[PDB]
Amino acid sequence: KVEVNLAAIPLGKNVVVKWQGKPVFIRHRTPHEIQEANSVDMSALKDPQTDADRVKDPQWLIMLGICTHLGCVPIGEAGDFGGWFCPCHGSHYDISGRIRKGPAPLNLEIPAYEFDGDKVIVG
Amino acid sequence: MTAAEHGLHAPAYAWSHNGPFETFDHASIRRGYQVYREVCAACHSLDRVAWRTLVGVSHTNEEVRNMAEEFEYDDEPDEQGNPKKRPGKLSDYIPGPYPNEQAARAANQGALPPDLSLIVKARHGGCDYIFSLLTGYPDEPPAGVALPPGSNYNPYFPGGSIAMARVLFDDMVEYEDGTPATTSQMAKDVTTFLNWCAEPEHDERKRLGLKTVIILSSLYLLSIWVKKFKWAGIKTRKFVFNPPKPR
């Protein structure tokens, strides 16, 4: 369990951590693209899913940037709505990690991240 | 060889962990960590002991977190490649005072202070040698020795001339439980802490040894009975011999 903290990383460009041997998104989060992660298609694309049960911090975002299909890597902040092109098969995620593309079956996994307040540290 | 170059033998002190059912006195390990940090850490290192091994043995979690965060370790470099430092965490090891061997030999007049994380297993005498060495500095080296400059006399050290001066004096460390910190009190506590550092498995090793010796002596006596049972027919076998009639 490694614990990476808040105040030394500003609002609006990526971190991709390597924890336990695996790399994962974190971002400080954007005003109506958090609230465009309220603009979401519920099920005319792949998954009916959960921004509350996916990320509980309204302003920050780790989850497991292992690509959806069988385990490749994306880009940072160039793509769909200002986001994350995985070129592993040509597919796309941002500020809550949702598929609008490709052969991907499910969204991405979120580990048990907890807090120094609501300061994001992963375990 | 001469008993001088042998070194005088350390006597048998009544340590509270000598004995097959005994445990390290953990209060003395906590006080011995204080004695190490305030006196011994200026010269010797402890690089085999992680910080996380102290939690639940001598200090709590918050105390070891603060004692780790008061040091600086090397981090992985930033996105520009420049080296970066980091406050310590529980995963890190206890840092030594010198960055290499040459800084140690420079700061201690040629001699190198040994790493103390295995030193009671590395000296014949155990904890008694360490206690007798720390408390065994006479005020004067006895009549006729050619003591080289920078060297001190300690008869428990082989040869007599040790490059470490007397470092334990009375009331140089205040204990936070109010124990009177004499020379022998501080030497007792730091020797118990060093013995824990060498053998951190000591208490569970003795507990498992109790279970194992009980189960194996049970099995040994029970196997003596089962052998005598299975062999009773051969032990109590009788032979008679009537010589056959000649033909």
């Binding site: 390597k18 336990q20 041997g21 695996k22 790399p23 385990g71 490749c72 890597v73 592993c88 | -």
Partner: protein
């Protein structure tokens, strides 16, 4: 009596390799066993002389292999000999097994010999997988992760057995040091199982390509089959010296010269070529638990063969349908091996599923039906009524 009989050790050596009565009819396919013995000695000796220079940490494994290649005298000979000799060991072992199930050697006097053979086959597959994992390239690492994350499909204790295999949470330093200790160890278990293979063979003796009894004329193994084995030994050493000295990285994958990197997937994870058919079997099933159950079933289906062979004559020497469907099975195995090296694209998943079904229908459907049909054809072709 002679000293080679009146000893303790020379009695065993005499009884197994000098005065062993062999059937005189046995062809060149009966040299694969002595060839596998030579291959095993090659692997053990070259592996020991490379383990004298190998360091097994995750930060030193790959560079220790290149230290063997570049700094050790004749170390490229040792590494190329070990790798290509492992692959040659598996080609010869496939020939040994294909001879065995062509000539009916699995049948009723020799079922324990067949089963000790299947145990030896499982152990060699495990040994080579661990040894490929020790070099810690890019195919090595990601092969280790997909094959060990196979075992997470067991629905109760799967995560804890994969965390016990890994020694942690993914393939890293405990996993690599484990795999080195085991990749040493399992070859000596293979040597013990080979001694048991020979012991189970020696009670009834070897078969012959006619399938009739060979008890009538027999030849001592010394001075006849010693030299008939020497022919294939020199041929095998010639072909291996070709691949070692003129074409060494041919059978291997190029991505094992990239050091292992846990963050970059190499876009086609394939094992070494001999595990490709079982990889295609595993890949064909659209479930992971059924996938590993079907792969282990694909190698444990060699045990149902002495009970599904329903014919009264041993071997396919005198049957036409058994010969035809035998070679259908062999080229099905080769197509399965070629399907296992391709991506999961659109004709290949159906081709791998149909070839897996043909692989299983050979042992369980084709051999009984063809055996019964050949039985009644052999009867009514020559009895009159």
């Amino acid at each position: 009596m002679a000293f080679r009989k009146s000893n303790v050790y020379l009695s065993l050596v005499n009884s197994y390799i000098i005065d062993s009565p062999q059937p005189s009819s046995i062809n060149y396919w009966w040299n694969m066993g002595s060839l596998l013995g030579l291959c095993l000695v090659i692997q053990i000796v070259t592996g020991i002389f490379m383990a004298m220079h190998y360091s097994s940490n995750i930060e030193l494994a790959f560079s220790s292999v290149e230290h063997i290649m570049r700094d050790v005298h004749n170390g490229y000979i040792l590494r190329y000999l070990h790798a290509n000799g492992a692959s040659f060991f598996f080609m010869v072992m496939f020939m040994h097994m294909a001879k065995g199930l062509y000539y009916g050697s699995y049948r009723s006097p020799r079922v324990t010999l067949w089963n000790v053979g299947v145990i030896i086959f499982i152990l060699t597959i495990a040994t080579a997988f661990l040894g490929y994992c020790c070099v810690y390239g890019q195919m090595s690492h990601w092969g280790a992760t997909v094959i060990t994350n196979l075992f997470s499909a067991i629905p109760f204790v799967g995560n804890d057995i994969v965390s016990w295999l890994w020694g942690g949470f993914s393939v890293s330093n405990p996993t690599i040091q484990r795999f080195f200790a085991l990749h040493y160890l399992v070859p000596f278990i293979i040597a013990a199982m080979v001694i048991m293979h020979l012991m189970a063979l020696h009670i009834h003796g070897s078969s012959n390509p006619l399938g009739i009894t060979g008890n009538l004329d027999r030849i001592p193994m010394h001075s006849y089959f010693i030299f008939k084995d020497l022919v294939t030994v020199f041929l095998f050493m010639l072909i291996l010296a070709l691949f070692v000295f003129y074409s060494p990285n041919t059978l291997g994958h190029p991505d094992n010269y990239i050091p292992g990197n846990p963050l970059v997937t190499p876009a086609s994870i394939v094992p070494e070529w001999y595990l490709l058919p079982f990889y295609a079997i595993l890949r064909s099933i659209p479930d992971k638990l059924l996938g590993v159950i079907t792969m282990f079933a694909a190698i444990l289906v060699l045990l149902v063969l002495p009970f599904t062979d329903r014919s009264v004559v041993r071997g396919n020497t005198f049957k036409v349908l058994s010969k035809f469907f035998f070679f259908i099975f062999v080229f099905n195995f080769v197509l399965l091996g070629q399907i296992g090296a391709c991506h999961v694209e659109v004709p290949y998943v159906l081709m791998g599923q149909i070839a897996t079904f043909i692989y299983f229908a050979y042992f369980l459907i084709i051999v009984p039906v063809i055996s019964t049909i050949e039985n009644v054809l052999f009867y009514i072709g020559r009895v009159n009524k």
